[PDB]
Structure 1
Amino acid sequence: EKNPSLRMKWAMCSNFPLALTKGDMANRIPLEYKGIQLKTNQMCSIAAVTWWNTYGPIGDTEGFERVYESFFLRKMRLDNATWGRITFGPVERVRKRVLLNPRRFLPVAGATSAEFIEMLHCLQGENWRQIYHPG
């Protein structure tokens, strides 16, 4: 099909649209859960996924943060940041090559460090301006 969304809409309602791997971890999912056919004897149903996050073994998560420091760094930069007032007057933005994350030509009126660019969407505006300080 030439539209991924519609192909996905039709795929979602199918009985078993998910492809399941073979292993012991794949055998701990019940064949049927209160009527719903989670799997077949491999093909998988989205209900089987929902069961996994609901009932199943609690896997350990110790190196997840270390693997994903960049994203968690973004989250804490947002959380620890502070917000000022908002200026509604016209703004003058100078086109510059800026770095999105810690490159593209964007209109920026103020700090051009990657910390501000990552949030630029919520700071600049045609007829408004906001003061932001990354954490």
Structure 2
Amino acid sequence: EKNPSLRMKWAMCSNFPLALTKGDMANRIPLEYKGIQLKTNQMCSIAAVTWWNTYGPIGDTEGFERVYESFFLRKMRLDNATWGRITFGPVERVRKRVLLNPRRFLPVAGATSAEFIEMLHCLQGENWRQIYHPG
């Protein structure tokens, strides 16, 4: 099909649209859960996924943060940041090559460090301006 969304809409309602791997971890999912056919004897149903996050073994998560420091760094930069007032007057933005994350030509009126660019969407505006300080 030439539209991924519609192909996905039709795929979602199918009985078993998910492809399941073979292993012991794949055998701990019940064949049927209160009527719903989670799997077949491999093909998988989205209900089987929902069961996994609901009932199943609690896997360990110790190196997840270390693997994903960049994203968690973004989250804490947002959380620890502070917000000022908002200026509604016209703004003058100078086109510059800026770095999105810690490159593209964007209109920026103020700090051009990657910390501000990552949030630029919520700071600049045609007829408004906001003061932001990354954490």
Using the size of structure 1 for normalisation, the TM-score is 1.00
Q: Structure 1: any 5+ residue segments left out of the alignment?
A: none
Query: 1:53 corresponds to which residue?
Result: 53
Deviations 1:86-131 (A, max 9, x none): 0000000000000000000000000000000000000000000000
Query: 1:64 corresponds to which residue?
Result: 64
Deviations 1:72-97 (A, max 9, x none): 00000000000000000000000000
Q: Describe the SS at the equivalent of 1:130.
A: strand
Distance (whole Å) between structure 2 residues aligned to residue 128 and residue 112 of structure 1: 18
| Deviation at residue 7 of structure 1 after TM alignment | 0.0
| Deviation at residue 16 of structure 1 after TM alignment | 0.0
Which aligned segments of 4 or more residues in structure 1 are displaced greater than 4 angstroms? none
Distance (whole Å) between structure 2 residues aligned to residue 94 and residue 86 of structure 1: 20
Q: Describe the SS at the equivalent of 2:116.
A: helix
| Deviation at residue 58 of structure 1 after TM alignment | 0.0
- Computed over aligned residues only, the root mean square deviation of the Cα atoms, in angstroms, reads 0.0
Distance (whole Å) between structure 1 residues aligned to residue 6 and residue 83 of structure 2: 40
Correspondence list, 1:1-135, <5 A: 1-135=1-135
| Deviation at residue 27 of structure 1 after TM alignment | 0.0
| Deviation at residue 8 of structure 1 after TM alignment | 0.0
Q: Describe the SS at the equivalent of 2:73.
A: helix
Using the size of structure 2 for normalisation, the TM-score is 1.00
| Deviation at residue 2 of structure 1 after TM alignment | 0.0
Deviations 1:27-53 (A, max 9, x none): 000000000000000000000000000
Percent identical residues: 100
Q: Describe the SS at the equivalent of 2:110.
A: coil
Distance (whole Å) between structure 2 residues aligned to residue 104 and residue 62 of structure 1: 35
